[PDB]
């Protein structure tokens, strides 16, 4: 019979065509909705359509079934593609045949395996061509994750090194991150992740069938990052007691987290955080083919049970009583994927927000799920998934009540805190920051904003607030350099033409990005502050390194809160600010000419800003397109104040194009300090 000796998958051509060149190392990895090539090597009889009939059968999942789309059998139609799964002969030479297979744009995602059934006469021999991986295609016009443009496809599906935005609203810091979705073994890790969710354990066949929908895959991926408690990827922790594992700030790449999760069976990786969850989810989604970007919202009202009215009761000193209340997060990071939604009303296609951080649900504290960004913009809270929570995270209202010792309460005019004021992501192509707050909220004070609030029953906050002549804000003169003492001003501007005798309550506390305040690092209690008519007074507060050294969080955030209170019945004024203390810059240099499969040396240096010595200095670099594993060096000698630490590392780049070298510094006193540098690998 027509027996075959070997089947030659064209790894190079398929990888180049389907943009899966990095993934096509040893196994074929193609994208649905596109024709991929294949080669058959028959020894002597070659192939004749007259008597030889080939019918491919492709199998997926532990419970295949034709009606569910997992299993598909299709003949060798030489003329055209008459259906979803088709195979046509494109070239026929001596001893060899070529094939151009095609997959439906709505095929399930996962590990498929082929089977040739060569039926010549009565001899229907059954073969096994091999396995391959099917991923979401952003290039197929009929696919649900199709992107019209090309730069967006490169940035969101093929770029494996990006920026996570942190710090404060007034000072955005672009911390580098190495997604590495195309790293060695990452795709298998993502498949195992998709093969261990509770839905798969409940009904494997239904899960495999429903993997075709990108929204379901997004839900499964986001829910298995942290939300799953049994064998989730990470284990959240917020108190600064990460000694049992790796601190959240220490992570520089999701590849390490995924490899640690896979190696230790499936146990939770130690002490991740919200932006870590977003980075891991973005890595998994990008590996699976879904165009995903990490989006950070500053002053987010996360974990408020979707409440649109947040009331904070404070004391006469401005300190928030009632510890049961949840603080306003300085920033919250969630992913945003590109999908088309048939399950919703027409027009709700495009960017969909996934939040892998479990909020406080009324049932079980689950994740959020894909809500259209346009749905949040128009306030369509009635969508399928958790629209109200994401809407509250960007459109909440905060009321700061002051409860004095007399038992009475007053409303403080807090004009500084705006929920969801700055939403940022990485720009397409360049390294700049793209401020996408306009796609989540309508412009303030506009008719569209009013109608969106009316559709969301949220028009309560639109009402005008107090308009007293007193005005006040927290001002910063120079850059916030960590490890040095500084002064932060409280600016009072008066235009009422009325002399005021008020008392001011400066207080600075080390705070994490969750809003968990720590011990005070400086205070100032002015009791007879005088404000002249049409005057403008700046009251400085001195913050000392010896004060915030002990309790500073690893995110280098300090909250300065000041309260201007008049003894008379008139209301109270409040002003808060978040200061990001800048870590010292990591100077990265590359010596030699960057060439593929050639030795490279990276000269990394840092200058210690602290007045004391760092003991356990440790550099760690990672790059998806530069190295196959993290390069870690430990300096065995402490570096004194002002002294400069300097190390050299060896790299063996293996991929072309542009790459980012993510560098992390970890010492006993200077915490995780990040750095990056773009390198272009030469053709050689
Ligand atoms: N590192 C750091 N720099 C800051 C921060 N806030 C402000 N700055 C610096 O202050 C400058 C802007 O000053 P600005 O805040 O507008 O002054 P203000 O309007 O009087 O409060 C920028 O160049 C920043 O470098 C912060 O939290 N961290």
Numbering used by the authors: 4 to 687
Which sentences did the original study use to describe this structure?
Transglutaminase 2 (TG2) is a GTP-binding, protein-crosslinking enzyme that has been investigated as a therapeutic target for Celiac disease, neurological disorders, and aggressive cancers. TG2 has been suggested to adopt two conformational states that regulate its functions: a GTP-bound, closed conformation, and a calcium-bound, crosslinking-active open conformation. The primary function of TG2 is to cross link proteins via the formation of amide bonds between glutamine residues and primary amine groups. Using SAXS and cryo-EM, we show that guanine nucleotides bind and stabilize a monomeric closed conformation while calcium binds to an open state that can form higher order oligomers.
X-ray crystallography structures of TG2 have revealed that GDP or GTP binds to a “closed” conformational state that occludes the protein-crosslinking (transamidation) active site and thus eliminates its crosslinking activity. Previous crystallographic studies of TG2 bound to GDP have shown that TG2 has a propensity to crystallize as a closed state dimer. To confirm that the structure of TG2 bound to guanine nucleotide is in fact a closed state monomer, we used cryo-EM to solve a 3.2 Å structure of TG2 bound to GDP. The cryo-EM structure of GDP-bound TG2 is in excellent agreement with the crystal structure with an overall RMSD of 0.8 Å; TG2 adopts the monomeric closed state and the cryo-EM map displays strong density for the nucleotide binding site and the bound GDP molecule. As described in crystallographic studies, GDP is stabilized through π-π stacking interactions of the guanine ring with Phe174 as well as several hydrogen bond interactions between the α and β phosphate of GDP and a trio of arginine residues, Arg476, Arg478, and Arg580. Importantly, due to the stabilizing interactions with Arg580 in wildtype TG2, GTP is able to bind to the closed state TG2 monomer by achieving a high-affinity interaction that can overcome the flexibility of the β-barrel domains. The SAXS experiments were carried out at 25 µM TG2 to achieve a sufficient scattering signal, while the cryo-EM analysis was carried out using 3 µM TG2 as was necessary to obtain an appropriate particle density, which made it possible to capture the monomeric form of the TG2 open state.
